[PDB]
Amino acid sequence: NYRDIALAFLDESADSGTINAWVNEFAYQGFDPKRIVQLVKERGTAKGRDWKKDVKMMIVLNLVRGNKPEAMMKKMSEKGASIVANLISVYQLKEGNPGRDTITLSRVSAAFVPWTVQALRVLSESLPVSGTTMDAIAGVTYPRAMMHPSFAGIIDLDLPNGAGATIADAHGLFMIEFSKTINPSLRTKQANEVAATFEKPNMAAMSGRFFTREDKKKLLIAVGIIDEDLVLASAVVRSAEKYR
Amino acid sequence: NYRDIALAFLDESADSGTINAWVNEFAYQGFDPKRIVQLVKERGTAKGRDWKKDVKMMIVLNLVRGNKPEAMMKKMSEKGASIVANLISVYQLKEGNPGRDTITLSRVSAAFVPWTVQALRVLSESLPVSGTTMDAIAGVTYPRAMMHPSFAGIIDLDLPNGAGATIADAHGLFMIEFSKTINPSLRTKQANEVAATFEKPNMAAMSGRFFTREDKKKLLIAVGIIDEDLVLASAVVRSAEKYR
Amino acid sequence: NYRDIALAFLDESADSGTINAWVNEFAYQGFDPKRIVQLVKERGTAKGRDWKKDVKMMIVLNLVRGNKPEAMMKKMSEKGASIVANLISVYQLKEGNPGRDTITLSRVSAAFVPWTVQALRVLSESLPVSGTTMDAIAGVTYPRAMMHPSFAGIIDLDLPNGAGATIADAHGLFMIEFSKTINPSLRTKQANEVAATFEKPNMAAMSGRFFTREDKKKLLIAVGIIDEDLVLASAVVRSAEKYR
Amino acid sequence: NYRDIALAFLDESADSGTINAWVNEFAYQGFDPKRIVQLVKERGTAKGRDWKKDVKMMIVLNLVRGNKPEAMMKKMSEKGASIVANLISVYQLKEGNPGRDTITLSRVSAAFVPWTVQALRVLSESLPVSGTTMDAIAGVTYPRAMMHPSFAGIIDLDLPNGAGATIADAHGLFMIEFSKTINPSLRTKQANEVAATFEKPNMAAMSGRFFTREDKKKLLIAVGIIDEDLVLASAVVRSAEKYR
Amino acid sequence: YRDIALAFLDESADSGTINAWVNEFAYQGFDPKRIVQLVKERGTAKGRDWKKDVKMMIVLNLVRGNKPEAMMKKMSEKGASIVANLISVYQLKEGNPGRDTITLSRVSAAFVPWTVQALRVLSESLPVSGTTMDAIAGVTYPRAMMHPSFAGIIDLDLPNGAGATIADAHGLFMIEFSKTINPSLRTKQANEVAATFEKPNMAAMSGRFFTREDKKKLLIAVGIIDEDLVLASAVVRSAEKYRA
Amino acid sequence: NYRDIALAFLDESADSGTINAWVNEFAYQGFDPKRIVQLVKERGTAKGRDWKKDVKMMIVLNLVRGNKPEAMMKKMSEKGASIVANLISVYQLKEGNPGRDTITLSRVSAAFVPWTVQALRVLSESLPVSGTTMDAIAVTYPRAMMHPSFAGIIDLDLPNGAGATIADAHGLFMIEFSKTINPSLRTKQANEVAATFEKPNMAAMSGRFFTREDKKKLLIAVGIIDEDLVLASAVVRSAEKYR
């Protein structure tokens, strides 16, 4: 009968190689970092622009005004809103979370994370969640580099002695306060309830294939998250503790 | 008079044998595993495809991305989403819990449970609830084979020495954490409250008539839950205790 | 003047006989037991079926799966759901509480109560509220015949020494637990609050004109609630006490 | 100057006679008892019917099934609903509280109150609020004649020693329980809060000019509320006390 | 343009012309001059005794409220015919509309020297009866004060703080009036209800239509004060009981 | 590959100067004070009116009756409402928070803040929150601070952190003002109400219309600061009571 067909699957092949190949091909992917790095350089250069300057502007714009380019234009200076109007036109910018071939301010920050991680140190007080606010929650001075969701793309979870998990918990402390500020609906809700709202896309970002373990290592050292002896920074271990 | 006809039913036969035969035939049955095993083969072979490879893919897809094929396509790689688009077209896939003659990713997992129970061992960390997360709750290394609701179709409750009840309690430990991850609304709610949400469909799955007690015995022995002498594993007894 | 006309109604006839005749003709009903016994016989015999076998099946089906025939089909065996599909087609079955000329599984149980009262004794553990569960609440073994709302149509409240009232209180003990199981919204509610939710339709059922006091007496004796000397069973008097 | 015009109204006439004449002409009414007694007689006699029999039916129907003729038809016997369909057609019956020239079951009971006050004594247990329920609240046996809002049209507030106020308080005890039963929204709310919901239409009904003080006295005596020497019943005074 | 805005530092800010603007722009509500004018204008144009019509509109407002369209449906055919004519001529509306719109409450407010007289003859036909008000105060409450429009007669700047005592005396009625108008405030505390009408009553007492001298004449006319500016004994008792 | 391009951004310039220049150019505004000062003068002079008198009237009107010109007309004197009808017609006045080229009573008070700050001293008792009410909560509270438009005069980058003390002093009024404007926040906690106006006030204080030197002169003229940058005693008390 058909029960025999289903039971016959006990002797059917289950190759860990081809299964993990399928897992990677089927896994959660909000957007392709390779595609938007490509679409930025191609669209920006075709419109004869310093696309490298535009990404720095789009990252500054994202960090301080959000991911709604059309909305932020109305409540901005005439000179500033003229730049934003040009950035929307050239890079075909959109709001929220659209398709894989669509560029958003949040995505530019995510794919070009080696610059966004630098920019965070100079405009920490102009952020939705200010640096001083974040310093009060953590106790010790919270790492400015971690003060944006795009930091997740730098986290290497497979780091020896479970260092990557401690970093993910440290960054989660910010993510909770960030979510409460972005959507005030979650301001009264419990800490673990808010943690589950960003758990899936952050995990997908940390498990990213764009930057290698070695690239992530160099980036994590560069912004002082880990010392030369691969040991974590004292503020990062405090933020992971306060996360619970 | 019609009152006489209704009263005449006092002398009408009420055979406990034929009534219990009707009770069993009218009982609650989640889906027809025979029909979906049939429709996968029929639809798959008609579109000249390796339907046996397709079920493996559909199971991998269900274990790692869920039961909404249309929704998971939008947040996936172009190569991956192209495979999913083909699987929806051939197998006429749908979402949630529709009619008996409708195929869903969760149903393919459930009916072809002898394969999915093997696949779970290689992609335990790619699951919504990771294996290492499940190991922390249980204390001892939690059985990977049990880390999906479809495992219920392998459970034989009528096992001697009440072994089937111990297995159902062991699988329930996962089901609680799985439900909290699927719907984050139940993350703050009490353990016994979450247990009642999946109690009825799991019981209906365990009381299934597709696989016989002998087939279930072979499957439970194969995956390593019980030995040939029908003795539960060191971890399956720990998981059932931590369940309370 | 019109004051005269209205005042003239003081000497106008108000015969308690013709008023109670109107009260009975105008009273709340929901459905006509004579009409549904007629329609089952007429529809069943027209479609050349053993309609007497069908009513037993419809009763078994109602007791164990409810009053939604379309819904219960989807979560049932292919053989079982094929029988239900045939029963819906011939008897033009519907859900909930429709018109007086519409047949429902609950109505078949209500009008053919002399057979349903027998069926309850053999499938007591397959009921939404099991017999053993009912035995725990009552203390003494609860009468299986009373374990369905349709039992109300057999209750004669005008029984000497107020025996009928004791039966209505005994049946109410089940009705409370039955309501809490049917709608879990009433689970946390107080006992007297749940009692008022079914008080009106049960009273209307108990005041029914289909079965005469003599027919009700025969029915109540037939299922061991009372004996020829109108002495009601000890379990029935215990259930009425526990009802408070 | 316009301030002079307004100030000139200090010397303008304020005749208590013509003001009370206006108060009576402007006071809250609802419907005209003369008009509905007329329209029942006119519509009834035009359709060649015993309209005097029909009002007794409409009253019985009203007391036991309410004021929604279309709604009560669906949950009634085929013979009964056929009578109601005829009564709606002839008397152009409507629901709730419409215009002055519209007939409703509640208005027929109000208009023809000398006949409804009699009917209440024979169908006290078939009422929405049963007589025995009303006896429990009052302590002493509550007057059956008072167990309907239409009783208000018999109350004479201008009775010596303020007897009319004591009757209005006794009838209010029923009105509270009646309102809670009609609309279950008011069941949990405070006694004085529910009292204000029916205070205005009841006051308008008691202040009625249809029946004279002498007619009201005769009616109040004929249904044992008072005697020839204007001394009220012991149950009415108890009901007025329990009202607070 | 920054120079133009900064030049306003040397620009004139005359306290005289600013306070002249403040008085001209301050919160008025309705214009009593305009509605006295429009009543006299519209009334005389439709060849009516507009002086009789204002007394009718005042009687109508005191006993039936401010919704002319609504009160028509629940009124006598003769009465509702007068109200239909008054709406047509004086273009009457509901609630609180524009400054050039006439409402029953506004007619009572602007022609307060006549409304204050009418209150003495229909005290028992008011929403809050005079006898009810006599029970609360402990002394016979002034009938003239038994309407919110009385506030337009109060002169707060009266020597020895007499106006404040009158305001407190009128507040005792206003509390009971508010509880009757909106039964939502029936259970709420005395000081909580006092704040709901505090702002519009204060605005009414600070009114510019009647001068201190006109207010003195009006307060003298309806026995609140005498020639010597001495306050009535019932008015000082009502102000004391106000703090309850 | 493209991973190399993204990694190359590690050596790409991140100059705090040009970044803060972008931050200022991209920051939240609401309306353009230059544009509304222009539109008032242009529309006012085109209708042959003393537009300088009209702004003082619009400011008085805003301070005492709010930002809904159509609504305040219905509950006003015939002479007063006639002036308001003319002001709406000439200056094309609107309600709430519309576009950058739209004039509102609140915007006239904000852009012409050097006059509104003077007007506040003479009509302090006619304000939604009276001056005497504000004196009770605080020492005599500065009348100049008794309106949200005062924020446009605050210079947060003042030495010894003087600007921050002024922002805390003005916040004491803003809390009581918010509770009066929306009675929904009357029972709510002090820090909860403080967060409702924190974002637009910060955006107003960080404004580029008036320079640090202009702001210094303004705060000096209305006695919050003296020619030696030392704070007024009432301003330091209001900042303390703010917590």
Short mmCIF file of N, CA, C and O in Angstrom, two decimals, chain A residues 119-200:
data_model
loop_
_atom_site.label_atom_id
_atom_site.label_comp_id
_atom_site.label_asym_id
_atom_site.label_seq_id
_atom_site.Cartn_x
_atom_site.Cartn_y
_atom_site.Cartn_z
N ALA A 119 30.98 55.74 11.40
CA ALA A 119 30.08 56.89 11.47
C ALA A 119 29.36 56.97 12.82
O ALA A 119 29.17 58.06 13.33
N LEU A 120 29.01 55.81 13.41
CA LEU A 120 28.30 55.71 14.70
C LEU A 120 29.04 56.38 15.86
O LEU A 120 28.39 56.88 16.78
N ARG A 121 30.38 56.38 15.83
CA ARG A 121 31.22 56.94 16.88
C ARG A 121 31.16 58.48 16.92
O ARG A 121 31.29 59.05 18.00
N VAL A 122 30.94 59.13 15.75
CA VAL A 122 30.92 60.60 15.68
C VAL A 122 29.50 61.20 15.85
O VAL A 122 29.40 62.35 16.27
N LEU A 123 28.42 60.45 15.54
CA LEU A 123 27.05 60.99 15.67
C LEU A 123 26.21 60.22 16.69
O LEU A 123 24.98 60.16 16.55
N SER A 124 26.85 59.66 17.75
CA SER A 124 26.19 58.86 18.79
C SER A 124 25.04 59.59 19.52
O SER A 124 24.05 58.94 19.88
N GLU A 125 25.16 60.91 19.70
CA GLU A 125 24.13 61.69 20.40
C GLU A 125 22.99 62.12 19.47
O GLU A 125 21.91 62.44 19.96
N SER A 126 23.21 62.07 18.14
CA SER A 126 22.18 62.43 17.15
C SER A 126 21.30 61.22 16.78
O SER A 126 20.34 61.36 16.02
N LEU A 127 21.62 60.02 17.33
CA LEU A 127 20.89 58.78 17.06
C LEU A 127 19.52 58.72 17.77
O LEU A 127 19.37 59.38 18.81
N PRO A 128 18.53 57.92 17.25
CA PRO A 128 17.23 57.79 17.95
C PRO A 128 17.41 57.44 19.43
O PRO A 128 16.83 58.10 20.29
N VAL A 129 18.27 56.44 19.71
CA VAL A 129 18.68 56.08 21.06
C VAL A 129 20.07 56.70 21.18
O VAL A 129 20.96 56.32 20.43
N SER A 130 20.23 57.73 22.04
CA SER A 130 21.53 58.39 22.17
C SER A 130 22.52 57.48 22.92
O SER A 130 22.11 56.54 23.62
N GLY A 131 23.81 57.75 22.73
CA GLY A 131 24.90 57.00 23.34
C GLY A 131 24.89 57.07 24.86
O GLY A 131 25.12 56.06 25.53
N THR A 132 24.62 58.28 25.40
CA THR A 132 24.54 58.56 26.84
C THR A 132 23.38 57.79 27.48
O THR A 132 23.51 57.33 28.62
N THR A 133 22.26 57.62 26.74
CA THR A 133 21.07 56.86 27.16
C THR A 133 21.47 55.38 27.28
O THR A 133 21.12 54.73 28.27
N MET A 134 22.23 54.89 26.29
CA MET A 134 22.73 53.52 26.21
C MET A 134 23.78 53.24 27.30
O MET A 134 23.87 52.11 27.77
N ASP A 135 24.56 54.27 27.70
CA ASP A 135 25.57 54.19 28.75
C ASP A 135 24.93 53.97 30.12
O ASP A 135 25.50 53.29 30.96
N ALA A 136 23.73 54.56 30.32
CA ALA A 136 22.97 54.48 31.57
C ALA A 136 22.41 53.07 31.79
O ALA A 136 22.44 52.59 32.92
N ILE A 137 21.91 52.42 30.72
CA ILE A 137 21.33 51.07 30.75
C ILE A 137 22.43 50.02 31.03
O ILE A 137 22.26 49.17 31.90
N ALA A 138 23.56 50.10 30.30
CA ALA A 138 24.68 49.17 30.42
C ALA A 138 25.53 49.40 31.68
O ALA A 138 26.15 48.46 32.18
N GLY A 139 25.56 50.64 32.17
CA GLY A 139 26.36 51.02 33.33
C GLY A 139 27.70 51.55 32.86
O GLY A 139 28.03 52.72 33.11
N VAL A 140 28.46 50.69 32.16
CA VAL A 140 29.75 51.01 31.54
C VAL A 140 29.45 51.65 30.17
O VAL A 140 28.34 51.45 29.65
N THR A 141 30.40 52.42 29.60
CA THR A 141 30.24 53.09 28.30
C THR A 141 30.00 52.05 27.19
O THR A 141 30.89 51.26 26.87
N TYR A 142 28.76 52.03 26.66
CA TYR A 142 28.31 51.10 25.62
C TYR A 142 29.04 51.34 24.28
O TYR A 142 29.16 52.49 23.86
N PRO A 143 29.49 50.26 23.59
CA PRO A 143 30.19 50.45 22.31
C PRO A 143 29.31 51.08 21.24
O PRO A 143 28.27 50.53 20.87
N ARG A 144 29.73 52.26 20.75
CA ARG A 144 29.05 53.07 19.73
C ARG A 144 28.87 52.30 18.42
O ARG A 144 27.83 52.44 17.78
N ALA A 145 29.86 51.47 18.07
CA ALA A 145 29.89 50.61 16.88
C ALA A 145 28.69 49.65 16.83
O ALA A 145 28.21 49.33 15.74
N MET A 146 28.21 49.21 18.00
CA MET A 146 27.09 48.28 18.17
C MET A 146 25.72 48.97 18.12
O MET A 146 24.70 48.28 18.02
N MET A 147 25.70 50.31 18.18
CA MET A 147 24.47 51.10 18.27
C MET A 147 23.71 51.27 16.94
O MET A 147 23.25 52.37 16.61
N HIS A 148 23.48 50.15 16.24
CA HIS A 148 22.69 50.06 15.02
C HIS A 148 22.45 48.59 14.68
O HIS A 148 23.38 47.80 14.84
N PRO A 149 21.25 48.19 14.18
CA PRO A 149 21.02 46.77 13.83
C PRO A 149 22.03 46.19 12.83
O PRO A 149 22.31 44.99 12.93
N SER A 150 22.58 47.01 11.90
CA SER A 150 23.51 46.54 10.87
C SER A 150 24.82 45.94 11.43
O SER A 150 25.51 45.21 10.70
N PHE A 151 25.13 46.19 12.72
CA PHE A 151 26.29 45.63 13.42
C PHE A 151 26.29 44.09 13.36
O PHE A 151 27.37 43.49 13.34
N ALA A 152 25.09 43.46 13.34
CA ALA A 152 24.89 42.01 13.28
C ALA A 152 25.69 41.32 12.16
O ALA A 152 26.19 40.22 12.36
N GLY A 153 25.84 42.00 11.02
CA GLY A 153 26.57 41.48 9.86
C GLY A 153 28.06 41.31 10.06
O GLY A 153 28.74 40.73 9.20
N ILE A 154 28.58 41.82 11.19
CA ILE A 154 29.99 41.78 11.60
C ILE A 154 30.20 40.64 12.64
O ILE A 154 31.32 40.16 12.79
N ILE A 155 29.12 40.22 13.34
CA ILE A 155 29.15 39.18 14.37
C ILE A 155 29.42 37.79 13.76
O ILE A 155 28.73 37.37 12.82
N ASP A 156 30.43 37.09 14.30
CA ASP A 156 30.82 35.73 13.95
C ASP A 156 30.49 34.84 15.16
O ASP A 156 31.23 34.82 16.14
N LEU A 157 29.33 34.15 15.10
CA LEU A 157 28.82 33.32 16.19
C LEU A 157 29.70 32.09 16.47
O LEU A 157 29.78 31.65 17.62
N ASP A 158 30.38 31.57 15.43
CA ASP A 158 31.25 30.40 15.52
C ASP A 158 32.66 30.75 16.07
O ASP A 158 33.59 29.97 15.88
N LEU A 159 32.80 31.89 16.79
CA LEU A 159 34.06 32.31 17.39
C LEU A 159 34.44 31.40 18.56
O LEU A 159 33.56 31.06 19.36
N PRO A 160 35.74 31.02 18.70
CA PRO A 160 36.14 30.14 19.81
C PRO A 160 35.81 30.71 21.19
O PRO A 160 35.70 31.92 21.36
N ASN A 161 35.60 29.79 22.17
CA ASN A 161 35.23 30.06 23.57
C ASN A 161 33.83 30.73 23.68
O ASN A 161 33.48 31.25 24.75
N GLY A 162 33.04 30.65 22.61
CA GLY A 162 31.70 31.21 22.53
C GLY A 162 31.65 32.72 22.63
O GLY A 162 30.75 33.27 23.27
N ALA A 163 32.63 33.40 22.00
CA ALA A 163 32.75 34.86 22.00
C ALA A 163 31.65 35.53 21.18
O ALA A 163 31.16 36.58 21.58
N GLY A 164 31.28 34.91 20.05
CA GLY A 164 30.25 35.38 19.13
C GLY A 164 28.85 35.46 19.72
O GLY A 164 28.05 36.29 19.29
N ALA A 165 28.55 34.58 20.69
CA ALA A 165 27.28 34.55 21.41
C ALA A 165 27.20 35.70 22.41
O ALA A 165 26.14 36.30 22.56
N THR A 166 28.34 36.02 23.07
CA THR A 166 28.47 37.10 24.05
C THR A 166 28.28 38.46 23.36
O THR A 166 27.67 39.35 23.94
N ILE A 167 28.79 38.59 22.11
CA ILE A 167 28.68 39.79 21.28
C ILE A 167 27.20 39.98 20.87
O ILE A 167 26.69 41.10 20.97
N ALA A 168 26.52 38.89 20.45
CA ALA A 168 25.11 38.88 20.04
C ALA A 168 24.18 39.29 21.20
O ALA A 168 23.16 39.95 20.96
N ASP A 169 24.54 38.91 22.44
CA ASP A 169 23.79 39.27 23.65
C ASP A 169 24.04 40.73 24.01
O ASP A 169 23.12 41.42 24.44
N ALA A 170 25.29 41.21 23.81
CA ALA A 170 25.69 42.59 24.07
C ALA A 170 24.96 43.55 23.12
O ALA A 170 24.49 44.60 23.56
N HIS A 171 24.85 43.17 21.82
CA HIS A 171 24.18 43.95 20.78
C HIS A 171 22.66 43.92 20.97
O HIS A 171 21.98 44.89 20.60
N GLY A 172 22.15 42.85 21.58
CA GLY A 172 20.74 42.67 21.88
C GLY A 172 20.20 43.66 22.89
O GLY A 172 19.02 44.02 22.84
N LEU A 173 21.08 44.12 23.81
CA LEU A 173 20.77 45.11 24.85
C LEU A 173 20.36 46.43 24.19
O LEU A 173 19.42 47.08 24.66
N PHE A 174 21.05 46.81 23.09
CA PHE A 174 20.75 48.00 22.31
C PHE A 174 19.46 47.80 21.51
O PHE A 174 18.60 48.68 21.51
N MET A 175 19.37 46.65 20.80
CA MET A 175 18.27 46.25 19.93
C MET A 175 16.91 46.34 20.63
O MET A 175 15.93 46.73 19.99
N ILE A 176 16.85 46.00 21.94
CA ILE A 176 15.63 46.07 22.75
C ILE A 176 15.20 47.53 22.88
O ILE A 176 14.05 47.86 22.55
N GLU A 177 16.13 48.41 23.32
CA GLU A 177 15.88 49.84 23.50
C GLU A 177 15.59 50.54 22.16
O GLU A 177 14.79 51.48 22.13
N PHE A 178 16.22 50.06 21.08
CA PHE A 178 16.04 50.58 19.73
C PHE A 178 14.63 50.29 19.23
O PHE A 178 13.98 51.19 18.71
N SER A 179 14.15 49.03 19.41
CA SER A 179 12.82 48.56 19.01
C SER A 179 11.71 49.34 19.71
O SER A 179 10.72 49.72 19.07
N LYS A 180 11.89 49.60 21.02
CA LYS A 180 10.95 50.35 21.87
C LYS A 180 10.83 51.80 21.41
O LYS A 180 9.75 52.38 21.50
N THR A 181 11.93 52.37 20.88
CA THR A 181 11.98 53.74 20.38
C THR A 181 11.36 53.81 18.97
O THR A 181 10.58 54.73 18.71
N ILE A 182 11.69 52.84 18.08
CA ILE A 182 11.16 52.77 16.70
C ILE A 182 9.63 52.60 16.75
O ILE A 182 8.91 53.41 16.16
N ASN A 183 9.15 51.57 17.47
CA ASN A 183 7.72 51.35 17.65
C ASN A 183 7.39 51.53 19.14
O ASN A 183 7.78 50.68 19.96
N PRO A 184 6.71 52.65 19.52
CA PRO A 184 6.41 52.88 20.95
C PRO A 184 5.37 51.92 21.53
O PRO A 184 5.11 51.96 22.73
N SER A 185 4.82 51.03 20.68
CA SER A 185 3.84 50.00 21.05
C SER A 185 4.46 48.95 21.98
O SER A 185 3.76 48.37 22.81
N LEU A 186 5.78 48.73 21.84
CA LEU A 186 6.56 47.76 22.60
C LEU A 186 7.24 48.36 23.85
O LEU A 186 8.00 47.64 24.51
N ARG A 187 6.96 49.64 24.18
CA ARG A 187 7.55 50.35 25.32
C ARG A 187 7.14 49.79 26.69
O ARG A 187 7.95 49.84 27.62
N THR A 188 5.90 49.27 26.83
CA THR A 188 5.38 48.70 28.08
C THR A 188 5.56 47.18 28.15
O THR A 188 5.57 46.63 29.26
N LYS A 189 5.72 46.51 26.99
CA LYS A 189 5.90 45.05 26.86
C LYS A 189 7.20 44.56 27.53
O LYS A 189 8.15 45.34 27.67
N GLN A 190 7.23 43.28 27.94
CA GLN A 190 8.35 42.62 28.62
C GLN A 190 9.58 42.47 27.70
O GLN A 190 9.42 42.37 26.48
N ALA A 191 10.79 42.45 28.30
CA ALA A 191 12.09 42.37 27.64
C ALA A 191 12.23 41.16 26.69
O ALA A 191 12.69 41.35 25.56
N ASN A 192 11.83 39.95 27.13
CA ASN A 192 11.92 38.72 26.33
C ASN A 192 10.94 38.72 25.15
O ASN A 192 11.22 38.09 24.13
N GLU A 193 9.80 39.43 25.29
CA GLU A 193 8.76 39.55 24.26
C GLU A 193 9.27 40.40 23.08
O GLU A 193 9.05 40.05 21.92
N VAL A 194 9.98 41.50 23.40
CA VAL A 194 10.58 42.44 22.44
C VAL A 194 11.78 41.75 21.75
O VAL A 194 11.99 41.96 20.55
N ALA A 195 12.54 40.93 22.51
CA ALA A 195 13.71 40.19 22.03
C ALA A 195 13.38 39.24 20.87
O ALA A 195 14.20 39.07 19.97
N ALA A 196 12.17 38.64 20.89
CA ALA A 196 11.70 37.70 19.87
C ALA A 196 11.29 38.38 18.56
O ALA A 196 11.25 37.71 17.52
N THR A 197 10.99 39.70 18.60
CA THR A 197 10.55 40.46 17.43
C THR A 197 11.69 40.69 16.41
O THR A 197 11.43 40.77 15.21
N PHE A 198 12.94 40.80 16.90
CA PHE A 198 14.12 41.02 16.05
C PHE A 198 15.06 39.80 16.01
O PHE A 198 16.06 39.85 15.30
N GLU A 199 14.75 38.73 16.79
CA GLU A 199 15.58 37.52 16.91
C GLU A 199 15.85 36.84 15.56
O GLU A 199 17.00 36.52 15.29
N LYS A 200 14.80 36.65 14.73
CA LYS A 200 14.91 35.98 13.42
C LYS A 200 15.74 36.79 12.39
O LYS A 200 16.67 36.20 11.85
#
